[PDB]
């Protein structure tokens, strides 16, 4: 069933600065005309957030961008598309990509948001493909190349019904769809907001905070993951499946989120409209100290600038003897209790680990000492 | 510590790190420590933002040590 | 299931009473972690994860934040905060054959500790030397996975015990897990005691014109301190002012 | 308590097959594993096969592994080892091992009394 998609056009990676975006409300509590410093996986300001294109030029040799690989998820995913036409029908997350592993399936097939968690068999180049049927204009359903096969399902979501609209427009870019993706303590957070912007570059100078939109009790091991795309097929791209296809213009961009403290200023109307990021400069560290997002002429104290050390060295002496630990424990004859028998040991070298990986000892407990760091301590002397 | 004229007046700033003369990762060694971002100079003014052993700190659009 | 592959269930929108499990005496070990039982009916919860497996009677205390072994280690860690309940009955007379019962496994060797709420069902073998396994076994490659002699005649100790964790985690979330309790109709510019949803405190609640946006469920002051809270059932903001003080 | 009988073998001409039997009294054969082991005159104690209830059915040794077969009866609660392409080098004594846990956390390997194989050129 899947379609192996080749003809792939070689383009190097691109980069645009992150701005000020990528800052959510870290919780449900409410707050209101305060200054709150909350430490979170944020998108640090001013990066580079990589860019991926949707776009066929027309003409001889034109440039063909398809760009859908796969991208690690690392510790939380900024994904900021900018549309009008709504190409982008969702994404998957995964590490194995196949029926061994677990996976999850997010797809908005303009009717509802609907998020699987299954062991998918995930096609090479998994996407969801539309015919166009040109004698009445309609958009429907033709191919879905995402897995081979579904198994064994263990959760599975529907958002709110609706009916979204996937005609191609022209001129301006007009949706700016931003989401934050994490995967923490056994959850799956989906932050989101859209904006109506009218430009055709980089993103907008002013700052919008996500809303929270789902959180999923899913908790699923997840380290890499892929956006899927919505193609065409119609007379304007004749051919079979394998070639007989072409995308809408659009674009998105991937940044990956990093543990951050961030000062976020809730207005007294309810809503978040600043942020500042501590550690993007000494002015922002200046901020932070002193919860302000003003600071007056004068000098002030923030942190502490220590070198941090490089390696370890480890010195101990030249005296590579074991000690007689089977003198004791492989030793058939014992004393009384009131007679007990005392050995000491010294000036040799002790493994605790074959004594604590015996298991041959029902009752082993220690005091004052954790026992898994005795391999790592050295002793005046020991009795027996 | 941070050398700060005021957002009110501008968004330049000097670090100075104090009791760590200049090795550790323009930039002048003073008796207080290390400061990088404030330009030093053989004038003279009234003390403004006040460093330490008689070194003071904006002025012609920059930080002066 | 076995200890090493221990069943996960999720508990999430419904009502539970812990009162007909603490009350039944059916339990051998009913021992919880930062919650007295007997209040836990007054209590509500955004989730609740229920561990179940099966042990050998001697490890019953053995599953328990802090503590160490084999089991802990490799088959299933408690974290040092965790909050929740450990229930523990025999399981004897309903899991164990004459000649003894080794349908449950339990995991021997491992390369490192699990992590606490970790499940782990590789069964690749265990390197403890530097002799490369390789799929073979032998010296310094050995089976992680040892059966349990549950041997009905065998002592109680060494009996089989079903034994089942349940984890109460509680976040400033709307709460799915409630106890019986009651709703009662709420009333406003009296200074009363209240309990929104699991929250308990005292003082007045009045209307609000504070936007709840349809992701809030309660605002706070500077300290911690709930200054608004939405109603259940009527999805409603109140201020929660404290009731008139002051010195004589 | 435990014990395990070995049965077949013996003396056979070369390009036959044999089959032998572990039959386990005292405990099901339904366990963690069940190993064989195969041991020459002059040779070290090493592991060469074995065959698990869960993960990985069943494992064997490099030189060893898709060529001899091993199966397991429930019914009847008899592990069967058959063994084709028979030669001269397979003259060796055979056993099947388990491994048992007590109340005291110990973990013995219980041996049975074995086989004799020969095989003729
Ligand atoms: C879009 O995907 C969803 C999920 O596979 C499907 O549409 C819904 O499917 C559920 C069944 O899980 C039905 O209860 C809903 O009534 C469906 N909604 C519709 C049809 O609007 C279906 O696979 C896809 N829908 C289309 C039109 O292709
Ligand atoms: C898509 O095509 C690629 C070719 O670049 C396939 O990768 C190899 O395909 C061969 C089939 O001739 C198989 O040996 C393997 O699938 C791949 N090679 C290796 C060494 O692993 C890829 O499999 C194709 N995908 C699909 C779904 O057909
Ligand atoms: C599941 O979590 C483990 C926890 O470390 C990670 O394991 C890595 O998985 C990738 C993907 O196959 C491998 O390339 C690495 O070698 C694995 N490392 C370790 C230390 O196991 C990862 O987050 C997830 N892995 C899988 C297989 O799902
Ligand atoms: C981001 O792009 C590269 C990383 O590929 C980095 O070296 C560079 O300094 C950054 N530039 C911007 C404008 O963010
Ligand atoms: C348009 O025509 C196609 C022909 O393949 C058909 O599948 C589709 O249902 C039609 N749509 C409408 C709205 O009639
Ligand atoms: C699906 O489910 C089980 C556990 O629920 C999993 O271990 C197994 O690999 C899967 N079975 C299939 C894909 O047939
Ligand atoms: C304050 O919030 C209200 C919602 O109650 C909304 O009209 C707007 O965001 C703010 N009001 C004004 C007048 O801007
Ligand atoms: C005692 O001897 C046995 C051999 O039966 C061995 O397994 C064990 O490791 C010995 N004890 C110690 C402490 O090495
Ligand atoms: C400081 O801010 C005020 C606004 O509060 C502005 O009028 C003034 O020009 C700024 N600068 C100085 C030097 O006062
Ligand atoms: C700088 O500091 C170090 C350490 O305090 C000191 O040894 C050195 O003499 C100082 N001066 C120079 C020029 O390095
Ligand atoms: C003072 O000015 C002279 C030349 O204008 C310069 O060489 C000297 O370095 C200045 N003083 C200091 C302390 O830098
Ligand atoms: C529970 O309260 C909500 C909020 O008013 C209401 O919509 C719902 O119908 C109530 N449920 C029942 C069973 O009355």
């Not at chain 3, 030397?129 to 041997?151: A, D, I, K």
Request: glycine share 6%.
């Amino acid at each position: 069933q899947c379609v192996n998609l080749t003809t792939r056009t070689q383009l190097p990676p691109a980069y645009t600065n992150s701005f000020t975006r990528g800052v959510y409300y870290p919780d449900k509590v409410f707050r209101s005309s305060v200054l709150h410093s909350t430490q979170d996986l944020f998108l640090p300001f001013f990066s580079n957030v990589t860019w991926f294109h949707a776009i066929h030029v027309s003409g001889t040799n034109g440039t063909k961008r398809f760009d859908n690989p796969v991208l690690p998820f690392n510790d939380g995913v900024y994904f900021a598309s900018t549309e009008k036409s709504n190409i982008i029908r969702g994404w998957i997350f995964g590490t194995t990509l196949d029926s061994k592993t677990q996976s999850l399936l997010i797809v908005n097939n303009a009717t509802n948001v609907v998020i699987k968690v299954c062991e998918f068999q995930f096609c090479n180049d998994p996407f969801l493909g539309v015919y166009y049927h040109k004698n009445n204009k309609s958009w429907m359903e033709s191919e879905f190349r995402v897995y081979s096969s579904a198994n064994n399902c263990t959760f599975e979501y529907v958002s709110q019904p609706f009916l979204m609209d996937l005609e191609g427009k022209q001129g301006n870019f007009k949706n700016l769809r931003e989401f934050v993706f994490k995967n923490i303590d056994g959850y799956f957070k989906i932050y989101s907001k859209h904006t109506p912007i009218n430009l055709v570059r980089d993103l907008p100078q002013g700052f919008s905070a996500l809303e929270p939109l789902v959180d999923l009790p899913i908790g699923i091991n997840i380290t890499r993951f892929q956006t899927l795309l919505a193609l065409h097929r119609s007379y304007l791209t004749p051919g079979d499946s394998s070639s007989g296809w072409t995308a809408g213009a659009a674009a998105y961009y991937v940044g990956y989120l990093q543990p951050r403290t961030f000062l976020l200023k809730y207005n007294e109307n309810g809503t978040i409209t600043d942020a500042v990021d501590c550690a993007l400069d000494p002015l922002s560290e200046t901020k932070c100290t002193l919860k302000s997002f003003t600071v007056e002429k004068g000098i002030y104290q923030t942190s502490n600038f220590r070198v941090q050390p490089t390696e370890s060295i480890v010195r101990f002496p030249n005296i590579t003897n074991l000690c007689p630990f089977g003198e004791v424990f492989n030793a058939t004859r014992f004393a009384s209790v009131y007679a007990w028998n005392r050995k000491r040991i010294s000036n040799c070298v002790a493994d605790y680990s074959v004594l604590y990986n015996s298991a041959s000892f029902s009752t082993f407990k220690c005091y004052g000492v954790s026992p898994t760091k005795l391999n790592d301590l050295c002793f005046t002397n020991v009795y027996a | 510590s941070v050398i700060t004229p005021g957002t009110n007046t501008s968004n330049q700033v000097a670090v100075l790190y104090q009791d760590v003369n200049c090795t550790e990762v323009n930039v002048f060694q003073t008796r207080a420590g290390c400061l990088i971002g404030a330009e030093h100079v053989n004038n003279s003014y009234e003390c403004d933002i006040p460093i330490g052993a008689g070194i003071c700190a904006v002025a012609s659009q920059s930080i002066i040590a | 299931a076995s200890v090493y592959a221990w069943n996960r269930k999720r508990i999430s929108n419904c009502v539970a009473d812990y009162s007909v499990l603490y009350n039944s005496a059916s339990f051998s070990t009913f021992k919880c972690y930062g919650v007295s039982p007997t209040k836990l009916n007054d209590l509500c919860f955004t989730n609740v994860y229920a561990d179940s497996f099966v042990i050998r009677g001697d490890e019953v205390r053995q599953i328990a934040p802090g503590q160490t072994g084999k089991i802990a280690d490799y088959n299933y860690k408690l974290p040092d905060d965790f909050t929740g309940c450990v229930i523990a009955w025999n399981s004897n007379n309903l899991d164990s054959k004459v000649g003894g019962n080794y349908n449950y496994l339990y995991r021997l060797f491992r390369k490192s500790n699990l992590k606490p709420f970790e499940r782990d069902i590789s069964t690749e073998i265990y390197q403890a030397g530097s002799t490369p396994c390789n799929g073979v076994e032998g010296f310094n490659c050995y089976f992680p996975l040892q059966s349990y002699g549950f041997q009905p005649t065998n002592g109680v100790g060494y009996q089989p015990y079903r034994v089942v964790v349940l984890s109460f985690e509680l976040l400033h979330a709307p709460a799915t897990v409630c106890g019986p309790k009651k709703s009662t109709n709420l009333v406003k510019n009296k200074c009363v005691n209240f309990n929104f949803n699991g929250l308990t405190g005292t003082g007045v609640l009045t209307e609000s014109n504070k936007k709840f946006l349809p992701f809030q469920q309660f605002g706070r002051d500077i300290a911690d301190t709930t200054d608004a809270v939405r109603d259940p059932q009527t999805l409603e903001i109140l201020d929660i002012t404290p009731c008139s003080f002051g010195g004589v | 308590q435990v014990q395990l009988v070995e049965s077949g073998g013996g003396l056979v001409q070369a390009g036959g097959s044999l089959r032998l039997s572990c039959a386990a009294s005292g405990f099901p054969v339904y366990r963690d594993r069940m190993a064989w082991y195969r041991q020459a005159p002059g040779k070290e104690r090493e592991w060469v096969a074995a065959i698990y209830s869960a993960g990985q059915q069943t494992r064997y040794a490099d030189s060893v592994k898709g060529r001899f077969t091993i199966s397991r009866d429930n019914a009847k609660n008899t592990v069967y080892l058959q063994m084709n392409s028979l030669k001269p080098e397979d003259t060796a004594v055979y056993y099947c091992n388990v491994k048992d846990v007590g109340h005291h956390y110990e973990y013995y390997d219980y041996w049975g009394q074995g086989t004799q194989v020969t095989v003729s050129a």
